[PDB]
Each structure stands twice: as structure tokens, then as C-alpha cells.
């Protein structure tokens, strides 16, 4: 069985950042993109496939990758959790978080 939206092609990748001090919001997002760019092989493909993230409620990001790709995140610096994403609103079929279109940051 499965949470609505958990199709194992959407992944929640939560990272760990230092605390004294914290990196800026832009630094955390940059860390998400570079981390995802590492796994995919290009920054162009990381911006394509990161559809959401947070630097407040949690410090992680959400991306359209398959499951064997998502295993490549494990062991990478800063990667805490590699978890199948799930709908926060099943009606809209939407995964929540601050949205990332392709440079467009519209908060929530």
C-alpha cells in the first residue's frame, strides 16, 4: 500500500546544514541544486527536476527522479533522508513546499 502521490518517482531529500551560523536561504537552495546536479550529471537537469523545497519547515528538496537514481543520493555529503514524496493535498495532487518552476520561487 501507498500514500497518495507516492509513485516512487518523486523524492524528498532532506539535508543537514550547520547551525552556528546557519547558511542563508540562498545557500541552502544552492546546496539542493548542486546536490541534485551531482546525481543527475548537469545543473541544467537539476533545475529541471526540482519542483519544490523548503528551508524553514524542513531543510530539504523534492525532485522528479526514479528510484534507482534516488539511491545515488545516499552517502553523499549533507544527505540525511531519501524518502518517497507524498501528496500533502490529494485533490490538487500537489506535494507541497515552496514551489520551484525553473528559477521561479513562489513561497507557500
Amino acid at each position: 500500500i501507498m500514500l497518495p502521490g507516492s509513485d516512487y518517482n518523486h523524492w524528498l531529500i532532506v539535508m543537514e546544514f550547520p547551525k552556528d551560523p546557519a547558511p542563508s536561504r540562498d545557500q541552502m537552495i544552492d546546496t539542493y541544486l548542486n546536490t541534485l546536479a551531482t546525481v543527475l550529471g548537469s545543473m541544467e537537469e537539476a533545475k529541471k527536476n526540482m519542483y519544490a523545497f523548503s528551508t524553514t519547515t524542513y531543510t530539504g528538496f523534492q525532485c522528479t527522479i526514479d528510484e534507482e537514481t534516488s539511491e545515488k543520493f545516499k552517502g553523499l555529503p549533507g544527505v540525511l533522508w531519501v524518502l518517497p514524496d507524498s501528496y500533502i493535498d490529494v485533490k490538487n495532487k500537489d506535494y507541497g513546499g515552496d514551489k520551484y518552476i525553473n528559477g521561479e520561487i513562489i513561497p507557500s
Binding site: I1, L3, L12, T57, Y58, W81, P84, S86, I88, G97
Partner: protein
């Protein structure tokens, strides 16, 4: 229809194994704008742990993080228990290392998972850490740590625990003291295990069992037997494991006449159809030459 009334339903469905119906309820109260909470996530996770529903566990975990519950003690204790019972102790530890607040239940949960995995060093290092941070161990901590010291031959730590247990007022606690008998026995010190036994004001089956096992592994077979009849004279009823230990004690000796009286006892207590007593009887009779008997035992 409150959060509490939706949670009471999910919990019942969760305790009955009905994860599909429990999740439908979850998604329904989410749909109706009724927020899940501590009990909801912890209810679902506890079922995932019972059934090994790792994947749903991992998705809930995702849902837990996205809805702002990182660090919540009840939820994250359940996360630890779920990853632990699904075999994933590196993940259990990650959840632990991330918790800003830890109570004795937090430590106990991760200690119990580590001991079941044979990762005994990490359990003792974790116990030391718990003492270092001023969290008071309880009956379950002392018991699980002493059992770990016993399996590890960690005599010096066990003896320090013995001091700590004495000072914290645990002298009369049978669970902890059963653990001390085990620790001394498995560390090669039957005399100290005897001292522990003779000091305990209360003794149950497990304390007789623990000390019998230590005598038998030491080859102190006659002492094991004297003690078994001591147990019977005090009214403590033997169990599956008592019978298996003293029959093998008998099946390691020319103790047939006693193995026969125990066979009678075993028949009258309802233990003839018990699998390990079965084999302890078949074993005892075989080592005593009479092989028909063993066949007679088997042919049930």
C-alpha cells in the same frame, strides 16, 4: 467529529493490522481539513513496526517531516522503533541523533533495538552517554545493559553497573537482579552469581532459570540439579526452558532415575507436547541408552 475521534478509529484499525482502512481514514481527515497529530503518526508507525511495513513507514516519515513534526518525541520515538524492527539500525540512529529532546524512553527504544541486532558495543556506549547526560536508567535500561555486558564478557562495566544499581535503590528489583546473575555467570564468576541469587528477597522462574543455565554452561551439573529441586520445593513452577536445561543436565550424567521423575512431572504439568521438552526428553533418554523410550517420546 474531532481529531480525537478520528484518531481513536485509526488506532483500533492499526492495532488490528488493518493498515489499508487506517490510511483511508487518515487521508479522509486530511481531506476534511482535520490535521493529523502525534497520536496519528505514532499509531500508524507502531503498526508499520509490527508488520515490517518499511515502505509505508518511510512515506509517513516523509509526511511527518513535511508537516513540521521533526523532533517531536512521541513521533520520533516511534520512528526509532519502526526503523529498528524493520532491521535498519543506521536509520534508527539517524532519527535518534536528530532529536533535540530525549527521555529515558528514547534511549530505551534504541538500546533495545541494538541489543536485538547484536550491536552490543553501541548499546553500552549509548548507555554510558545516557548516564553522562543525566538521564536516569530504569529497570529496562539496567536489565538490557547487563544482558549486553553478559554476552560481551564486559565484566568491569557490569560491576560498575552493579554499584550504580545498588546506589539507585534497585536491590529488590528482580528483573535487574536476574540480569546481574546472567552477567556474572557469563563472565566466568559463578560464585558472584550465587551471591546475587542468595541475596535476592524475591525469586521467580527466570532467576532460577538464569542460574541453572550458568551452572550448566560451566559444567556444574550436580549443582544445577540440587537447585532445580530447590525451585520445586519453594513452589516456583518450572517452564519450557527449566525442563530443557535440567533434562540436558540429566542427559550429561547418569541421572536417568531423576530424568524419569521429571518426565512424570513434565507429563502432569502439561508439557509433554512441548517442542523443546520433546527434544530434551528424546535427548535425555538417548544419552541414557534406553533408545526405545526416545522413540516412544518421538512417536507422539
Amino acid at each position: 467529529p474531532t481529531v480525537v475521534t478520528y484518531n481513536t478509529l485509526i488506532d483500533g484499525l492499526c492495532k488490528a493490522g488493518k493498515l489499508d482502512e487506517a490510511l483511508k481514514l487518515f487521508e479522509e481527515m486530511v481531506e476534511k481539513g482535520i490535521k493529523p497529530d502525534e497520536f496519528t503518526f505514532s499509531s500508524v508507525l507502531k503498526a508499520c513496526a509490527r508488520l515490517g511495513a518499511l515502505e509505508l513507514g518511510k512515506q509517513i516519515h516523509g509526511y511527518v517531516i513535511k508537516s513540521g513534526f521533526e523532533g517531536n518525541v512521541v513521533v520520533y520515538n516511534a520512528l526509532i522503533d519502526m526503523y529498528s524492527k524493520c532491521g535498519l539500525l543506521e536509520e534508527a540512529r539517524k532519527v535518534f541523533d536528530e532529536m533535540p529532546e530525549k527521555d529515558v524512553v528514547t534511549y530505551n527504544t534504541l538500546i533495545d533495538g541494538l541489543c536485538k541486532a547484536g550491536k552490543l558495543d553501541e548499546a553500552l556506549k549509548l548507555f554510558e552517554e545516557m548516564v553522562e547526560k543525566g538521564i536516569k536508567p530504569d529497570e529496562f535500561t539496567f536489565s538490557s545493559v547487563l544482558k549486553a555486558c553478559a554476552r560481551l564478557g564486559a565484566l568491569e562495566l557490569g560491576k560498575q553497573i552493579h554499584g550504580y544499581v545498588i546506589k539507585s535503590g534497585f536491590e529488590s528489583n528482580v528483573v535487574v537482579y536476574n540480569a546481574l546473575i546472567d552477567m556474572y555467570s557469563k563472565c566466568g564468576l559463578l560464585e558472584e552469581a550465587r551471591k546475587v541469587f542468595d541475596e535476592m528477597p524475591e525469586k521467580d522462574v527466570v532467576t532460577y532459570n538464569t542460574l541453572i543455565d550458568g551452572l550448566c554452561k560451566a559444567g556444574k551439573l550436580d549443582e544445577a540439579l540440587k537447585l532445580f529441586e530447590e525451585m520445586v520445593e519453594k513452589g516456583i513452577k518450572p517452564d519450557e526452558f527449566t525442563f530443557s536445561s535440567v533434562l540436558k543436565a540429566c542427559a550429561r550424567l547418569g541421572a536417568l532415575e531423576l530424568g524419569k521423575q521429571i518426565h512424570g512431572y513434565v507429563i502432569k504439568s502439561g508439557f509433554e507436547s512441548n517442542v523443546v521438552v520433546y527434544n530434551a526428553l528424546i535427548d535425555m533418554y538417548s544419552k541414557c541408552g534406553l533408545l526405545e523410550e526416545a522413540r516412544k517420546v518421538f512417536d507422539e
